[PDB]
Amino acid sequence: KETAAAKFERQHMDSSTSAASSSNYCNQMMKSRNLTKDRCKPVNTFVHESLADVQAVCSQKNVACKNGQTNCYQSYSTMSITDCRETGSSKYPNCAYKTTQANKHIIAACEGNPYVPVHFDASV
Ligand SMILES: [Cl-]
Ligand SMILES: [Cl-]
Numbered sequence: 001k002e003t004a005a006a007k008f009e010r011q012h013m014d015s016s017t018s019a020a021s022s023s024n025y026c027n028q029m030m031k032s033r034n035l036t037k038d039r040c041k042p043v044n045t046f047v048h049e050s051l052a053d054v055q056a057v058c059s060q061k062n063v064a065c066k067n068g069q070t071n072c073y074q075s076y077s078t079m080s081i082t083d084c085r086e087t088g089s090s091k092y093p094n095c096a097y098k099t100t101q102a103n104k105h106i107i108a109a110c111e112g113n114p115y116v117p118v119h120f121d122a123s124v
């Protein structure tokens, strides 16, 4: 079974580019990260910052998670991110995604020791 931290890494980290380069970024990344294997993951955000910078958010601003949990943290600075969401013509096994690049604060739910990100709650 994948650990919660490794699943967060695989689903939400893309430190290799500073930003989505084209409209096809999400189709490629969602496939590359195995988020379209058995079904199309509907929504998924990738963060274009170092893993260290993203893990550091766990010691930044403590804020409530949407679900009411109290282990969420909001990054003090904005980060380069890309939101990937299925378009209307998306249909497994032919997933299709809209790519939206933005610079915003990220909110992550953190847990464990080391205390690291295990869920991407939202961006602001
Ligand atoms: Cl791990
Ligand atoms: Cl995988």
Ligand SMILES: [Cl-]
Binding pocket: 043, 044, 045, 120
């Ligand atoms: Cl997400």
